[PDB]
Amino acid sequence: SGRENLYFQGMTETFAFQAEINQLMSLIINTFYSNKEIFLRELISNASDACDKIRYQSLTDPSVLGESPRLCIRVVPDKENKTLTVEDNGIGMTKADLVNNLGTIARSGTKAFMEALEAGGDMSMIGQFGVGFYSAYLVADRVTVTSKNNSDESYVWESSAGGTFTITSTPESMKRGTRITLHLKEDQMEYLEPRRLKELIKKHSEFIGYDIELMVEK
Ligand SMILES: Nc1ncnc2c1ncn2[C@@H]1O[C@H](COP(=O)(O)OP(=O)(O)O)[C@@H](O)[C@H]1O
Ligand SMILES: [Mg+2]
């Protein structure tokens, strides 16, 4: 009468965020900040880290790469849907990884980061406080993370920073890796511009050891 029923189509589970993470998300989504572009660097850094994980695993067991051995990153603007997406074919996240690493496990630097912000600290230091992912809310009102790890099924994590996130699964599903889609806020449409993205990618990617392909629309 669940996943095994002939008529089953999918399931969505709702989770609350760890208290400080919720506080941080409310702070980020509502704050005024004049250098919001740093969100892109955080997305690319996470893609790179995920590619490193599978790359090193592949040195002992090449079979982990399956049919996608060429590790790379894609940046996908979508003017029609008002979304910016960052895709990788890195290690991917299991259902547990999504629930644990994206909202429920406490990050020791969460409190210190919010305290730093009030004291005149730099929002660009977000990554150094171990909460880089949440910078997406500087430019987006909704974030959708689709991920597939070799040891699990594909799942979709989603949140509009309202105190909860969802985890969605379907019987059929996404190759290994992660796709992070940001639904941009009304005044953040510049991150859909090819020129703005090309320069921003070049700005914080001389150190990234993977090809970063900017997908052109129209
Ligand atoms: N593209 C991705 N692929 C795999 N795991 C990811 C990805 N993006 C984020 N994560 C996970 O979310 C966690 C939190 O990301 P972040 O807030 O940037 O912290 P950090 O990179 O310092 O660990 C990461 O540690 C990782 O487990
Ligand atoms: Mg990171």
Residue numbers in the entry: -9 to 163, 165 to 209
What does the published report state?
Among the chaperones, heat shock protein 90 (Hsp90) – alternately referred to as Hsp83 or Hsp86 because of the variable molecular weight amongst different orthologues – is a hallmark of the stress response at the cellular level, and a major component of the eukaryotic proteome. Its main function is to serve as a molecular chaperone helping nascent polypeptides avoid mis-folding and limiting protein aggregation during thermal stress. Although the compounds represent diverse chemical scaffolds with unique properties, they all inhibit the enzymatic ATPase function of the chaperone by binding the ATP pocket in the N-terminal domain (NTD), which together with the middle and C-terminal domains define the highly conserved Hsp90 protein architecture. T. brucei Hsp83 (TbHsp83), the subject of interest herein, is 59% identical in sequence to human Hsp90α.
In Trypanosoma and Leishmania parasites, Hsp83 is implicated in thermally induced stage differentiation. The structural differences observed between each complex and this previously determined parasitic Hsp90 were linked to the nature of the inhibitor bound to the nucleotide binding site and not to any Trypanosomes' specific structural features.
